[model samples]
Target: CGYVRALFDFNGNDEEDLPFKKGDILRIRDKPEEQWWNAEDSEGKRGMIPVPYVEKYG
Candidate 1:
């Protein structure tokens, strides 16, 4: 298993990136277009985290 340091805001409109913070468990939800899993916040909000991010854990 791997741990995520924080989550980044993909919306781009935000002035600063939002990180999930330490001890946060990120979730991956299935999507139609992409092959890899998508990252979600504690609230279940989804974002497209790059493969490298998850691969780093592996």
Candidate 2:
């Protein structure tokens, strides 16, 4: 519910998405759908990230 760790590196399909490396931690702000989610990183970078790209816990 709070944070998630990237399981695989995602290059992002578009500008509205986020590009993250494996193991990068990001916070889930909104789960507007099943595939894409609104998320932000520790640097406060916000964008939509793939649900399958990350594993949630803590």
Candidate 3:
């Protein structure tokens, strides 16, 4: 399996700080037909990422 490093701007603080600067290194598993919904990063900070982006690497 492969890993894809993704930086998610959470907390909506508009700044990268403690408890806000969190990165997600997702491991591609299987192909998902739908998109991933991230309520935490729903803002313009982080957009919706498709599963295929990561699956392709795997």
Candidate 4:
């Protein structure tokens, strides 16, 4: 029920990743980890991406 935006283009998952372009917004499920996040893209695709490339400012 939350949202997060990508600060850089990347593949959340290397093997079966989504092409996340900069500024892409994804729905967050709050399954936080050390350096990864579980979220779904606008295209309804879900995967794990680097949280370091994610925006933290409101």
CA lDDT of every candidate: 0.45, 0.80, 0.36, 0.70
Residue 21 in candidate 1 has what lDDT? 45
TM-score of each predicted structure versus truth: 0.36, 0.81, 0.30, 0.69
Cα RMSD to native, each candidate? 5.8, 1.5, 9.1, 2.8
As for lDDT, the candidate ahead, 2 or 4, is: 2
Evaluate residue 14 in candidate 4 and report its C-alpha lDDT on the 0 to 100 scale: 65
List candidate 2 segments past 4 Å from native: none
lDDT of 1 by residue, 1-58 (tens): 4333243333333333224443445665543445434566566666554443343331
User: What's the lDDT of the predicted structure labeled candidate 2?
Assistant: 0.80
* Candidate 1 global CA lDDT score: 0.45
Whichever of 2 and 4 has more TM-score, that candidate is 2
Model 4: runs farther than 4 Å from truth?
11-13, 30-32
Q: Over all chains combined, what TM-score does candidate 4 have?
A: 0.69
- For this target, which candidate reaches the highest TM-score against the unseen true structure? 2
Off by over 4 Å in 1: 1-18, 30-37, 50-58
Pairs clashing in candidate 4?
none
Give one digit per residue, the lDDT tens place, for model 3 in 7-49: 5434543233212233544543333436542212223343334
For every model shown, the clashing-pair count is: 1, 0, 0, 0
lDDT of 2 at 13: 58
